[PDB]
Amino acid sequence: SHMKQLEDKVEELLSKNYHLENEVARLKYKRNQEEIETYYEYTLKIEAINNEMRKFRHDYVNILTTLSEYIREDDMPGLRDYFNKNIVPMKDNLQMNAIKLNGIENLKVREIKGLITAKILRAQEMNIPISIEIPDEVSSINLNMIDLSRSIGIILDNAIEASTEIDDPIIRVAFIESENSVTFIVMNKCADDIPRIHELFQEEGRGLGLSTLKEIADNADNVLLDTIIENGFFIQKVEIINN
Amino acid sequence: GSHMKQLEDKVEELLSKNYHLENEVARLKYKRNQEEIETYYEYTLKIEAINNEMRKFRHDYVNILTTLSEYIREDDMPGLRDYFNKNIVPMKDNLQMNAIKLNGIENLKVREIKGLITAKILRAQEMNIPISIEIPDEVSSINLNMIDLSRSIGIILDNAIEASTEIDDPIIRVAFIESENSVTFIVMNKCADDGLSTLKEIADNADNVLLDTIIENGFFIQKVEIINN
């Protein structure tokens, strides 16, 4: 009958809404887990960076206190000598550090400016030579904040950790832009002394971070990853097309 | 009759509902997670504060290295002794109890806003614009979300700094004032001879945020009162 088809209809629409309502609830739960991962990841990142900066600052203030002995002994010659030999050159290293930081002024993507500055400060305070080159202003990059930040963080963290053993490390950073796309490049000097295997393996961490980096690259068609060794340098390139 | 009526209306209503759940699935699948983005902007504000703390520390350390250098070049052990005792021993000691003293940028206990103002102090220092901070009482909390509080303070100080570039003998004065009823942020700058829309937006979408301007004898005032809840 007619009427019976309606009854039959109301039923199958209620079933349809049931299934949809289960899908919405599942998607809300996935989005909830994602906000939680993002919160804890980034809140831990701030801690580790905060704590590292405080350490650097502690080393600096300690160095000033090595003067105390010369002052207590009223020994200006010994102080003059120690200070000119050991302390006063910091002030030049620090004036140069400040100069290199002006290299990020053309980065007009606020979302990642803090992140890049933090990595440059960390390299500088680890006494790893680092330069950043942004020949033209870059005001737009066509990749979600979270992924772009995670990509940059991994590449710069790899370049920095790989640089801590090396005798004469350098890191070079660049953002360039065609009218087609933006390309993020990090160059670092490869080591000569290769580590022992046991000094490298455990129970971010370079090779892991590179796959979760490949993850992000694969799951965007407009982001092109490249990994190059050229004249004793490791080069990580990520191109993001305005497509 | 009323059965057919109500059945037909039921199929209609369930179609709308199916329509609107279909929309909610699409939004959750395909639109950006605003909450996750806000978490990420809030993370950026903290790392900017950390960066500006370390840049301020470097600028301050360089000045200590300069001061020491001068005492040494002057062969002046007495001066150096008094300076080291009065400024470096305590910096090394770094006593919490010494906090009850500090009345300036040191009284701004909102990590992200202190970092932002440190950025603006350094920016001004580079452009030879003198800048005073008046925070007499400690300021632990402010009743505007970090993102809007940050954008608002930054625009007001950007205004002051841009305005101060044309002038000779410029100055910028910054203050945070806590009543029992509100927090009030004031910025004053010297004037020459005479963006901020995103700012007006924020004050118009906040009942507890009162944005004020004043012209007062060759110096401009910007003021924001944020009432507690």
UniProtKB/Swiss-Prot annotation, chain A:
Protein name: General control transcription factor GCN4
Organism listed in the record: Saccharomyces cerevisiae (strain ATCC 204508 / S288c) (Baker's yeast)
Post-translation changes: Phosphorylated by the cyclin-CDK PCL5-PHO85.
Location of the region described as Leucine-zipper in the Swiss-Prot/TrEMBL record: 6-27
Gene: GCN4
Subcellular location: Nucleus
Family to which this protein belongs: Belongs to the bZIP family. GCN4 subfamily.
Lineage: Eukaryota, Fungi, Dikarya, Ascomycota, Saccharomycotina
UniProt domain comment: Residues 89 to 100 and 106 to 125 define the N-terminal activation domain (NTAD) and the central acidic activation domain (CAAD) respectively, which can function independently to promote high-level transcription of the target genes.
Record note on quaternary structure: Homodimer. Each subunit binds overlapping and non-identical half-sites that flank the central CG base-pair in the pseudo-palindromic motif 5'-ATGA[CG]TCAT-3'. Interacts with the mediator tail; the interaction with GAL11/MED15 is direct. Interacts with the SAGA histone acetyltransferase complex. Interacts with the SWI/SNF chromatin remodeling complex.
Effect of a null allele: Abolishes recruitment of the mediator complex to the upstream activating sequence (UAS) of amino-acid starvation responsive genes. Decreases RNA level of genes involved in amino acid biosynthesis and cofactor biosynthesis during amino acid starvation or methyl methanesulfonate stress. Growth dependent on amino acid supplementation. Sensitive to amino acid starvation. Sensitive to purine starvation. Decreases cellular glycogen levels during glucose starvation.
Function: Master transcriptional regulator that mediates the response to amino acid starvation. Binds variations of the DNA sequence 5'-ATGA[CG]TCAT-3' in canonical nucleosome-depleted 5'-positioned promoters, and also within coding sequences and 3' non-coding regions. During nutrient starvation (low or poor amino acid, carbon or purine sources), it activates genes required for amino acid biosynthesis and transport, autophagy, cofactor biosynthesis and transport, mitochondrial transport, and additional downstream transcription factors.
Induction: Translation is induced by amino acid or purine starvation, or during growth in low or poor carbon sources. Translational repression during nutrient-rich conditions is dependent on four uORFs (upstream open reading frames) present in the 5'-UTR of the mRNA; these promote ribosome dissociation. Translational induction occurs in conditions reducing translation machinery efficiency, leading to ribosomes scanning over the uORFs, and increased translation of the mRNA. The rapid translational induction is followed by transcriptional induction at later time-points, independently of the uORF sequences.
Swiss-Prot record, chain B:
Compartments where located: Nucleus
Post-translational modification: Phosphorylated by the cyclin-CDK PCL5-PHO85.
Top-rank taxon: Eukaryota
Cleaved signal peptide residues: none
Protein family membership: Belongs to the bZIP family. GCN4 subfamily.
Swiss-Prot/TrEMBL domain comment: Residues 89 to 100 and 106 to 125 define the N-terminal activation domain (NTAD) and the central acidic activation domain (CAAD) respectively, which can function independently to promote high-level transcription of the target genes.
Protein known as: General control transcription factor GCN4
Organism: Saccharomyces cerevisiae (strain ATCC 204508 / S288c)
Entire protein: shown range: 250 to 274 of 281
